[PDB]
Amino acid sequence: NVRVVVYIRKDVEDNSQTIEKEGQTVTNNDYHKVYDSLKNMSTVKSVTFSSKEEQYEKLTEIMGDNWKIFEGDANPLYDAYIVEANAPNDVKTIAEDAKKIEGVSEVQDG
């Protein structure tokens, strides 16, 4: 009952490596940075990094192939961080805290 999801910038590649920007791919200083921040949340139970590709498959699995219609290889969803709040009343605190973590695009409370 403490399902919290933290959306990260489009292709922030927070849980990746080497980001293509400015001058080719450059080591990502945000490597596991969001994960670590969501792990030391203190009020957190567990943190799982859900890639955008996996999120799209998961979204279609929970909904179907009649919920999306952006375009071929469209990227409406980005990286997501599944965080388990200690309590159902903490999911709100976790979301408000993750909203200030690195580049959190958005947070959705399950």
From Swiss-Prot:
Disruption phenotype: Essential; cannot be deleted. Signal peptide: none annotated. Changing N75 to A/D: Shape defects; cells are significantly shorter and rounder. Changing W67A: Shape defects; cells are significantly shorter and rounder. Residues 1-110 are extracellular. It is found in: Cell membrane. Changing M63A: Shape defects; cells are significantly shorter and rounder. It comes from the Bacteria. Changing E53A: Shape defects; cells are significantly shorter and rounder. Changing F70A: Shape defects; cells are significantly shorter and rounder. Belongs to the ABC-4 integral membrane protein family. FtsX subfamily. Part of the ABC transporter FtsEX involved in asymmetric cellular division facilitating the initiation of sporulation. Required in maintaining normal growth and cellular morphology. Homodimer. Interacts with FtsE; forms a membrane-associated complex. Interacts (via large extracellular loop) with PcsB (via N-terminal coiled-coil domain). This interaction directs PcsB to equatorial and septal sites of dividing cells. This is Cell division protein FtsX. It comes from Streptococcus pneumoniae serotype 2 (strain D39 / NCTC 7466). The lineage of its organism: Bacteria, Bacillati, Bacillota, Bacilli, Lactobacillales.
